[PDB]
Amino acid sequence: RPRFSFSIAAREGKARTGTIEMKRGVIRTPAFMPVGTAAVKALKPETVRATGADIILGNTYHLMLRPGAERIAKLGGLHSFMGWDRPILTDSGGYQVMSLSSKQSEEGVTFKSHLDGSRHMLSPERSIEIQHLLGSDIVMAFDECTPYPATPSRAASSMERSMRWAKRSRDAFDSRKEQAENAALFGIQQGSVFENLRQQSADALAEIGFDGYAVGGLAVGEGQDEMFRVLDFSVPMLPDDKPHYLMGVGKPDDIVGAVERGIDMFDCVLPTRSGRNGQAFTWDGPINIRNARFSEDLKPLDSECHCAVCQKWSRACIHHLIRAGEILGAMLMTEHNIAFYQQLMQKIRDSISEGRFSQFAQDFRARYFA
Amino acid sequence: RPRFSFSIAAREGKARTGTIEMKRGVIRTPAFMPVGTAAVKALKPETVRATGADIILGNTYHLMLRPGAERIAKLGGLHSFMGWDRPILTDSGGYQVMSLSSKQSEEGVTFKSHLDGSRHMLSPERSIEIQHLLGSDIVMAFDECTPYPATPSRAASSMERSMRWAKRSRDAFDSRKEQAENAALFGIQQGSVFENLRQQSADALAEIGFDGYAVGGLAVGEGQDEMFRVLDFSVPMLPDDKPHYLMGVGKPDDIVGAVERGIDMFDCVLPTRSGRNGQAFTWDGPINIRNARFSEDLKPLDSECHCAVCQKWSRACIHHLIRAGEILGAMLMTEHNIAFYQQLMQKIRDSISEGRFSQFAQDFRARYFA
Ligand SMILES: [Zn+2]
Ligand SMILES: [Zn+2]
């Protein structure tokens, strides 16, 4: 297998299906990537694979806090550490610094650990280095988050700095032989909701050149309609022959709509996090399993789902496990939710390849929102 | 398979190995039974079986609190509810009332739920009924706990009431056709540390007649030496041709010593509970995986253990998962600990059958305590 090869097998409108080939494995696109912070929480990696995941996301910010990137490296890298031998994408660590920790400058950011109060630093160079130490397969350039809403001036300044940081990320990545030869690097488009800034960002990233392009700065409170409007003009600005990654997006209907607009890759904490909190995804919409109406419901979480949980376990049992605070409850909900997500991506891939994705999208929405 | 058949295949001194045959399966003795409260916490039942468990224990007190015995019955019984199709032993619910909840009389006990404050009742009749509703395979007679230390007078009064409750448990069990024909009933020996009371209790229970006999009222703070001394004279009082069950005992060295004194069955929360809390059992004694000395230890929890955890996972990874509070950490520790317990019981069974259990006991202790 090559270091990185993206091949498009079929198209329908803006939607694409294909494969990313990397040394550690093949990724079927459109792809959903479950999120990992040290483990997917409450699942063995074998179970994560069993649900159909081709790749997972590792949270750089959490991993650098504990157990630390250096220690992970000494222990043999992230793949060895979490027992997952297929591709891993790592974020830059930058978003969580903004959202979770407690000085920003052109050089980077210093922050205090939200756990120990210890001091840590991130910059384009240090982010890439940490991602190297983890040994990830797809590395994200380090960028500066733009809050929503943002004035044109603030959005432009943040986008411009992010583009300068994209070049530095690129150079840092290329300067490390082992990393440049074995991993891939994705650039991140910024520019908030402004078309002209999104275009300048797309232009800057294409000029630098990356293996894939993420649309960043969305799913930050703008609502689905505005997100879709921004995707409408933003995705066509990105090179057509490279993967398009929508970061932090994962409601099932968000995903279907984003694919309709040319997105190839997704990650979200939603199926895992909301799994532990009692929300299960079904083809008829999400349900909260804790609700009293399920106390004696012997049906599985979803009647069509092919996952191992739905083959054996009833809503009633999971209802009582979750309400009892039993770990198993969370284990079963999480397995089902991520498996549901993978089945969704499979139906998307099949429908595009068969030229009926538009019809699938309509059928999915009618039933999901009914 | 018969309702209940205990066959002794081999003996060495007071130690025995054999099988209990029941409708739902075969139990290899000496047996260790992992404890379940609604789920084994943090394990799928398939995993529990995979470790070698032939039977598990269900906590009647917790189950009657949530989801409730009646609801479990409506949902198809405990086997269906927790997805375990092999034998299940249920306790009477009586010990936890004393230890966990908040009026005692000759009729039984009333108590307030330690969760909701709701009022509940237990008596020999109601205990047996609840155990019927759960559909368990081995039912424990409802008894009255004797605290340690206890005066001869208090111990005698409690033992005598327990014996009257044993008769009532027996009659209640026999009065239910489906239960009497498909399940087994164990009596419980009381009498604290007093030989004469232990003898009167053994006599009373034998006169009533049960399928198995538990030695109750131990592991209540008396220390291993005193426990072994009480077992020395107590176990020979029980009918030799029926299983001998030591309740709530499960340190590995406790188990080996109890088997030397004629005990066939054990249950304890120790491997599961202490698993979640960072303690792993090894042939060289227990270790606390959270200790800094394991932060970069790439060896498995135990070098000889055949469990799936030890085939893949290092102490270093489990160290960081547990310290991060990750659910997976608890999952892996628990799987290993219960698998270790099953391997211990297997080595005990093999050594007895081969007439070398005395030598095994000595070798085990030397290494475990080294
Ligand atoms: Zn499912
Ligand atoms: Zn093990």
UniProtKB/Swiss-Prot annotation, chains A, B:
Stored SUPFAM superfamilies: tRNA-guanine transglycosylase
Record text on cofactor binding: Binds 1 zinc ion per subunit.
Q: Which superkingdom?
A: Bacteria
Effect the entry attributes to changing residue 92 to A = Strongly reduces activity
| Annotated transmembrane regions | none
The pathway is: tRNA modification; tRNA-queuosine biosynthesis
Q: Which organism is it from?
A: Zymomonas mobilis subsp. mobilis (strain ATCC 31821 / ZM4 / CP4)
Q: Name one GO molecular function term.
A: metal ion binding
Cofactor requirements of the protein? Zn(2+)
Function per UniProt: Catalyzes the base-exchange of a guanine (G) residue with the queuine precursor 7-aminomethyl-7-deazaguanine (PreQ1) at position 34 (anticodon wobble position) in tRNAs with GU(N) anticodons (tRNA-Asp, -Asn, -His and -Tyr). Catalysis occurs through a double-displacement mechanism. The nucleophile active site attacks the C1' of nucleotide 34 to detach the guanine base from the RNA, forming a covalent enzyme-RNA intermediate. The proton acceptor active site deprotonates the incoming PreQ1, allowing a nucleophilic attack on the C1' of the ribose to form the product.
Which residues participate in substrate binding? 91-95, 143, 190, 217
Region RNA binding: start and end of each range? 248-254, 272-276
Name of the protein: Queuine tRNA-ribosyltransferase
Question: Does the record's keyword annotation contain Zinc?
Answer: yes
Checking PANTHER family in the record gives: QUEUINE TRNA-RIBOSYLTRANSFERASE
SS bond partners: none
